[PDB]
Amino acid sequence: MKYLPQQDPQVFAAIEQERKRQHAKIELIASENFVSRAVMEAQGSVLTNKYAEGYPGRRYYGGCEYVDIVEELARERAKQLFGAEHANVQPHSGAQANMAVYFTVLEHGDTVLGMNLSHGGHLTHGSPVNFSGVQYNFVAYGVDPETHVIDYDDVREKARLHRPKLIVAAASAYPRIIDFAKFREIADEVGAYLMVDMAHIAGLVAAGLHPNPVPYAHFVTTTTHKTLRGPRGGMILCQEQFAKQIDKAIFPGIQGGPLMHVIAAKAVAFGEALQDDFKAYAKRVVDNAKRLASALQNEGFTLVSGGTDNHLLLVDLRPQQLTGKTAEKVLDEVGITVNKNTIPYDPESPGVTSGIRIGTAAVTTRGFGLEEMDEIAAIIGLVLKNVGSEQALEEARQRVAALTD
Amino acid sequence: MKYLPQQDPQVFAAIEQERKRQHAKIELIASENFVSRAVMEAQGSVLTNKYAEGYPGRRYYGGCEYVDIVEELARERAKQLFGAEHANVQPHSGAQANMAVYFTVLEHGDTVLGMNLSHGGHLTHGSPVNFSGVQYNFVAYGVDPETHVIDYDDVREKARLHRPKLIVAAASAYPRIIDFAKFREIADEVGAYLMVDMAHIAGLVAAGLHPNPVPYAHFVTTTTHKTLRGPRGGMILCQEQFAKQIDKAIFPGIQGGPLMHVIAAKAVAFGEALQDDFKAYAKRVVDNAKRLASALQNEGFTLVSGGTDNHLLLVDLRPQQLTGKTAEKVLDEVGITVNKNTIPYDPESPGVTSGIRIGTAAVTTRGFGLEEMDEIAAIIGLVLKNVGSEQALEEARQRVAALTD
Numbered sequence: 001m002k003y004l005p006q007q008d009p010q011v012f013a014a015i016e017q018e019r020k021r022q023h024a025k026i027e028l029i030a031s032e033n034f035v036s037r038a039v040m041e042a043q044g045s046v047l048t049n050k051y052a053e054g055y056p057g058r059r060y061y062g063g064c065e066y067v068d069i070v071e072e073l074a075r076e077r078a079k080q081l082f083g084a085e086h087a088n089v090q091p092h093s094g095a096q097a098n099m100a101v102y103f104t105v106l107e108h109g110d111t112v113l114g115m116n117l118s119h120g121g122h123l124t125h126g127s128p129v130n131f132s133g134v135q136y137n138f139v140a141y142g143v144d145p146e147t148h149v150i151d152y153d154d155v156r157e158k159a160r161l162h163r164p165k166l167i168v169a170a171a172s173a174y175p176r177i178i179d180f181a182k183f184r185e186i187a188d189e190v191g192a193y194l195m196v197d198m199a200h201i202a203g204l205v206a207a208g209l210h211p212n213p214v215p216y217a218h219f220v221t222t223t224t225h226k227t228l229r230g231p232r233g234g235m236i237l238c239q240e241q242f243a244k245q246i247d248k249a250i251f252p253g254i255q256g257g258p259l260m261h262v263i264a265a266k267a268v269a270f271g272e273a274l275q276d277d278f279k280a281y282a283k284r285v286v287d288n289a290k291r292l293a294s295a296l297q298n299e300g301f302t303l304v305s306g307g308t309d310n311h312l313l314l315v316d317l318r319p320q321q322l323t324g325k326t327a328e329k330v331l332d333e334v335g336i337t338v339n340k341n342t343i344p345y346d347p348e349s350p351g352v353t354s355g356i357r358i359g360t361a362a363v364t365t366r367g368f369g370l371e372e373m374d375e376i377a378a379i380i381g382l383v384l385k386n387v388g389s390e391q392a393l394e395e396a397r398q399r400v401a402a403l404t405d
Numbered sequence: 406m407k408y409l410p411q412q413d414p415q416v417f418a419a420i421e422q423e424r425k426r427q428h429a430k431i432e433l434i435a436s437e438n439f440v441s442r443a444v445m446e447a448q449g450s451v452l453t454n455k456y457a458e459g460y461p462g463r464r465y466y467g468g469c470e471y472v473d474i475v476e477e478l479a480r481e482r483a484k485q486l487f488g489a490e491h492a493n494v495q496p497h498s499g500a501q502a503n504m505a506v507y508f509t510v511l512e513h514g515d516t517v518l519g520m521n522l523s524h525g526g527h528l529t530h531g532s533p534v535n536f537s538g539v540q541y542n543f544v545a546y547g548v549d550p551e552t553h554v555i556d557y558d559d560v561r562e563k564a565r566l567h568r569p570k571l572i573v574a575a576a577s578a579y580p581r582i583i584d585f586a587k588f589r590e591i592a593d594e595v596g597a598y599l600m601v602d603m604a605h606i607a608g609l610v611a612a613g614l615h616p617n618p619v620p621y622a623h624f625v626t627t628t629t630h631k632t633l634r635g636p637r638g639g640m641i642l643c644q645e646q647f648a649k650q651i652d653k654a655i656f657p658g659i660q661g662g663p664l665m666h667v668i669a670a671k672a673v674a675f676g677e678a679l680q681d682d683f684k685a686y687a688k689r690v691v692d693n694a695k696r697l698a699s700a701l702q703n704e705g706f707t708l709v710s711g712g713t714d715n716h717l718l719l720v721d722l723r724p725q726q727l728t729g730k731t732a733e734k735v736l737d738e739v740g741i742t743v744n745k746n747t748i749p750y751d752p753e754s755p756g757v758t759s760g761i762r763i764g765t766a767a768v769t770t771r772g773f774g775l776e777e778m779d780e781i782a783a784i785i786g787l788v789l790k791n792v793g794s795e796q797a798l799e800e801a802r803q804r805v806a807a808l809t810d
């Protein structure tokens with residue numbers, strides 16, 4: 001940076017602390033990643049100056065010839081990446097992507113069936129303090145109490161009983177592959193639309209390491225950040241038949257002017273994801289997650305569903321007589337960043353929890369491999385088995401520092 | 406830029422075209438501006454990597470110590486700038502700022518009273534194709550057919566007849582000062598909340614050149630871009646008594662993770678607006694608008710309301726037997742960027758219109774002054790009085806080039 005340090009020392013000092021923090025800590029929060037310098041440069045461009053309400057070649061304002069090129073690059077690359085017939089790259093966030101799909105197919109008070117929020121469903125899949133649960137009548141399907149895999153017979157039963165207009169599949173804390181074919185079969189049986197929210201797994205889908213929801217879902221929503229490793233924002237994919245309605249839902253439906261600079265950054269990220277090296281990266285993400293899961297089990301930890309098929313895992317801390325909140329706090333003391341997370345059938349409140357959620361996307365981006373996964377698991381073992389020993393915590397601290405340099 | 410040119414030649418080439426376009430054209434679209442290099446650097450920072458759902462000191466995830474500093478700088482600077490008791494700097498856009506306020510105080514189907522969309526009201530103030538007009542029952546007040554000033558007796562009558570829960574004041578195409586005291590008096594009479602959407606005029610309010618809605622409104626919404634000259638995004642201001650509800654409306658109500666890098670950019674912009682030179686800038690904006698209005702009248706143009714109190718003006722093109730669409734198109738041919746705009750009581754559709762809207766914020770940022778306003782008016786006169794003369798259009802083209810260099 002050149003101009004910010006002189007113009008705003010306060011903001012610059014804080015950004016610099018954050019930058020240094022990102023390097024020093026071991027980031028295991030499953031939603032986190034580190035974007036490329038190219039992605040950041042795109043977001044820091046003069047495209048923030050341009051109003052471009054509407055769509056490429058169909059804008060309200062003149063002078064959009066070049067931002068049109070940018071948006072089309074984003075849409076076309078997204079379509080090639082996911083094999084979708086239509087992309088809308090304007091959503092400000094994953095929340096707004098979902099909001100737009102809901103706005104497209106639902107009326108106020110319509111019934112929607114989504115994943116139980118305590119079992120892995122997202123806030124925007126029917127929380128009573130979120131617009132989704134306030135605006136629509138959400139009902140929930142669960143995972144099996146033993147296997148922790150989605151109970152597809154429960155999905156089916158809930159769908160048949162409640163007759164939802166929309167079924168939502170996808171999760172923010174589900175460590176196994178989701179069967180989109182079964183979701184579509186159930187949707188078809190009850191005459192419901194299927195929406196898949198692939199935000200967490202989008203990078204894996206792009207790399208062919210998780211089944212693609214595009215052929216099975218009427219609508220696919222996602223964040224551009226997370227495993228896809230893009231700028232912070234949202235996206236909707238759908239077949240040509242819903243394109244006009246989806247576009248109208250985003251604008252003039254729920255948003256105003258799009259963030260053209262962020263859309264440029266989206267194009268950059270999609271360009272990156274189309275490359276062979278991203279496929280290699282995504283495989284290392286999944287490989288690292290399996291390795292970390294196995295190494296954690298070696299330490300004596302119990303994992304929700306007994307492991308992982310993707311980038312994330314959930315530790316059930318009940319055997320160690322620890323809450324997620326306690327584990328989160330002590331790991332923070334040694335420089336390991338996790339979040340407490342409700343586990344399926346958690347006896348604890350969302351404010352306390354019986355679990356921690358862990359993902360490998362961020363550490364993989366930093367170049368961590370299998371050996372580092374073993375060490376991370378060993379450090380977590382050292383910490384959580386010795387929460388009362390400042391000796392042990394200092395050793396963990398030094399071992400964390402050794403990993404990040 | 407260093408990394409984008411090598412990583413993504415396609416995106417870079419398009420950005421470079423846009424950058425060059427921004428320099429070459431005379432930007433008169435009233436919503437447009439040019440942000441500082443410091444603001445852009447902040448948006449292009451590593452803060453995009455951080456999930457920070459919640460609020461400073463009350464986040465869901467750990468590691469937010471530094472982004473907390475950034476958000477607090479934004480909130481505190483906003484409060485000093487506007488004399489507000491509370492700020493929420495998380496809204497992704499002006500649309501989302503409004504969405505959040507609506508979500509806070511209204512239930513589905515509640516009546517809201519806003520400015521007639523054909524008279525200057527915004528899309529998000531009740532368009533039947535926008536969430537506002539779909540989710541809530543919007544009724545409208547108008548401007549006087551002759552003076553084109555808001556008819557406060559009409560505001561009052563509509564409020565008393567329809568009994569709205571919420572009254573919205575503020576506009577995207579109103580060239581005169583809005584009387585927030587009268588709006589609050591009417592709101593008080595009918596027991597309605599008052600929301601002021603100051604997006605267009607926020608920079609002028611900050612500089613003390615338009616009366617401040619903060620003391621009169623329960624809620625003030627705004628874009629951080631436009632006259633305030635910040636990054637693309639939104640903000641809500643309110644008294645302490647609504648702070649908790651407003652914060653909850655933004656998250657977990659309507660959004661997910663905030664854009665921390667954009668929030669950094671917001672802090673930077675607010676820092677800039679607090680400086681004496683921004684006050685001088687904003688005065689030049691208003692001075693330039695008056696000068697341009699006067700010079701356009703000298704050319705024989707009729708202006709809606711007979712002039713301007715702010716950064717923007719509306720040309721009523723009926724005396725020249727031109728539509729807004731025609732004027733917009735021909736001005737585009739010579740390098741002057743305006744938008745067609747419905748005028749009050751327009752006999753034409755929104756797709757055609759009888760007016761063009763013009764604002765001086767962008768050209769003022771470029772350093773244009775009174776002499777340039779005279780020349781801009783003269784060029785517009787030359788063009789619109791000679792739409793059929795390629796000679797005249799080429800002369801205009803050369804005169805536009807002379808202004809931008």
Ligand SMILES: *Cc1c(COP(=O)(O)O)cnc(C)c1O
Nearest residue numbers: 093094095122171199200661662
């Ligand atoms: C992260 C996420 C979201 C929300 O994205 P934001 O950008 O935080 O609004 C929605 N759905 C799922 C499944 C997610 O993982």
Ligand SMILES: *Cc1c(COP(=O)(O)O)cnc(C)c1O
Nearest residue numbers: 256257498499500527576604605
């Ligand atoms: C520009 C504007 C908006 C919308 O802002 P976006 O950032 O485009 O969503 C809302 N209200 C008013 C009065 C505006 O001027």
